[PDB]
Amino acid sequence: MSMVVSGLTPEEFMLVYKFARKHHITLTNLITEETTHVVMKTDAEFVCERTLKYFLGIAGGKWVVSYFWVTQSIKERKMLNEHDFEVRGDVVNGRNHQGPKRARESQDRKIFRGLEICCYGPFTNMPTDQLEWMVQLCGASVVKELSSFTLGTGVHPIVVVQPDAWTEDNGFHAIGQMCEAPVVTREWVLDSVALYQCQELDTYLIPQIP
Amino acid sequence: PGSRSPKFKS
């Protein structure tokens, strides 16, 4: 077993290192394909904030559990069951959406199956390759450039953009002139991953000028 | 104080 933590202070992180070492669990700073557990700081109702580790843990169908799993196991002197500490929701998408459990149980039906995604333009706080990894874990293929979409019958194309990261450059309004795919904000990906439900595009579409 | 990890707000 291999874990990351998210939202912990240095002191909480060092306690988890001791816990993981005791129980023969690897602890890493960054998530990997071999990660089995993501330990999120939560409130006492198992609601967390959305970090990259949260998204990637769900996208991988991993155990996304509250830090209380660690502290309560210590208190009770017994390794407790992850399913009793599973994160129930987050402050953006809702307190009890159960996305983590849904993803853990739904990897035979991935939310972005049959989609080809171009993560286009600049992004803040989450490099392009990490957003690409996220969508690929959820079944999408990725292309680098708008001209690289397949435009076939076995996949559907989508352009994903973060308009605020473009600052004074309005070019994100001109993608439709270059490309036939729908253009949505990064929140379409993030909301769909957190909920482990592919959202409709309607509320995420970026207006395109002719 | 939390961590340095970015959060993704609504």
Author numbering:
A (entry chain A): 1650 to 1859
B (entry chain E): 2261 to 2270
The authors write:
Mammalian RIF1 (Rap1-interacting factor 1) is a multifunctional protein involved in DNA repair and replication. The two isoforms differ by a 26-amino acid sequence encoded by Exon 31, which is present in RIF1-Long (RIF1-L) but absent from RIF1-Short (RIF1-S). In summary, our investigation establishes RIF1-Long as a new functional binding partner of the BRCA1-BRCT domain, crucial to protect cells from extended DNA replication stress by enabling RAD51-dependent repair of broken replication forks.
With Serine 2265 phosphorylated, this ‘phospho-SPKF’ sequence corresponds to a potential interaction site for the C-terminal tandem BRCT domains of BRCA1 protein, which recognise the motif ‘phospho-SPxF’. We found that the tandem BRCA1-BRCT domains bound strongly to the RIF1-L phosphoS2265PKF peptide, with interaction affinity comparable to that for a phospho-peptide from BRIP1, a characterised BRCA1-BRCT interacting partner. In contrast, the tandem BRCT domains of 53BP1, MDC1 and TOPBP1 did not bind the RIF1-L phosphoS2265PKF peptide. Consistent with this, we found that mutating F2268 of the RIF1-L phosphoS2265PKF peptide abolished its binding to BRCA1-BRCT (inverted triangles). Treatment with λ phosphatase also abolished binding of the RIF1-L phospho-peptide to BRCA1-BRCT (squares), confirming that S2265 phosphorylation is essential for the interaction. Mutating S2265 to glutamic acid did not enable interaction with BRCA1-BRCT (triangles), indicating that phosphoS2265 could not be substituted by this negatively charged residue. To directly visualise the binding interface, we determined the structure of BRCA1-BRCT in complex with a RIF1-L phospho-peptide by X-ray crystallography.
